[PDB]
Short mmCIF file of C-alpha atoms in Angstrom, two decimals:
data_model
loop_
_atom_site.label_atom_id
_atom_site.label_comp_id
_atom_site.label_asym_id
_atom_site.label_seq_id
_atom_site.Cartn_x
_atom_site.Cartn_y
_atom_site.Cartn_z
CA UNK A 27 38.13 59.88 77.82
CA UNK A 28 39.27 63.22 78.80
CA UNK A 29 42.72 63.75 81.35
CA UNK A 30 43.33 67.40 82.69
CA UNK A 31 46.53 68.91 82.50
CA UNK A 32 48.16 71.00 85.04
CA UNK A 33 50.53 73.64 83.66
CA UNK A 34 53.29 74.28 86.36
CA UNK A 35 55.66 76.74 84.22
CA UNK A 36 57.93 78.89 86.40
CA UNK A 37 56.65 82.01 84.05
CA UNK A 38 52.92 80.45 83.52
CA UNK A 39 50.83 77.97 85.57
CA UNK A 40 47.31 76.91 84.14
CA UNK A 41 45.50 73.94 83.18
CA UNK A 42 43.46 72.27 80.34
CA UNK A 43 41.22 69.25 79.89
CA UNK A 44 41.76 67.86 76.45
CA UNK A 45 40.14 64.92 74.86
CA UNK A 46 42.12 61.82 74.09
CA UNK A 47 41.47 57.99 72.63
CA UNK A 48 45.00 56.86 74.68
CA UNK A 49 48.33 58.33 76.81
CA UNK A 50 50.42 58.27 73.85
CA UNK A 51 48.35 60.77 71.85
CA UNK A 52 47.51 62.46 74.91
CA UNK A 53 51.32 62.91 75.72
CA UNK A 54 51.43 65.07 72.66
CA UNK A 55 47.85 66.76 72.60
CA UNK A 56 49.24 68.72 75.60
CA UNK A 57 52.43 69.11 74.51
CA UNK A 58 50.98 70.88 71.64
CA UNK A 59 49.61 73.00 73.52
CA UNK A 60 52.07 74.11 76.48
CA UNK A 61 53.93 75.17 73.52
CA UNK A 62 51.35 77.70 72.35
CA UNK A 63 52.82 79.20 75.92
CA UNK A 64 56.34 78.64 76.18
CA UNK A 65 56.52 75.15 78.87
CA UNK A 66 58.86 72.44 77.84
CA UNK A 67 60.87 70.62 80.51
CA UNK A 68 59.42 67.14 82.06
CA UNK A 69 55.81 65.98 81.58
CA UNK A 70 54.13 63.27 84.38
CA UNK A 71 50.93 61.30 84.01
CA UNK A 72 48.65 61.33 86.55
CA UNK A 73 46.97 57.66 85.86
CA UNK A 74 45.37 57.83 88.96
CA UNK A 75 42.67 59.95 88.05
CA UNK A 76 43.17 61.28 85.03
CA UNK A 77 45.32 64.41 85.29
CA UNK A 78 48.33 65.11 83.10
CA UNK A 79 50.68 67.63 84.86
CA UNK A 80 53.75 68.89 82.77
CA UNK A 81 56.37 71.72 85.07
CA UNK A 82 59.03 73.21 82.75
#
């Protein structure tokens, strides 16, 4: 499946959709990327409907 992240960084907001087999390796997928920007802080999982959402 595919979850979308929400990028709430007090310098950069955004989002990405990024394709993962489960949470774990999803958990760092985006991580990976927020840090090709600078957000690192807490990360939440939107299991709901599918929307990671990190806010450094």
């Amino acid at each position: 499946m595919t979850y979308k992240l929400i990028l709430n960084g007090k310098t950069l907001k955004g989002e990405t959709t990024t394709e993962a087999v489960d949470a774990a390796t999803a958990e760092k997928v985006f991580k990976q990327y927020a840090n090709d920007n600078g957000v690192d802080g807490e990360w939440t999982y939107d299991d709901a409907t599918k929307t990671f959402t990190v806010t450094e």
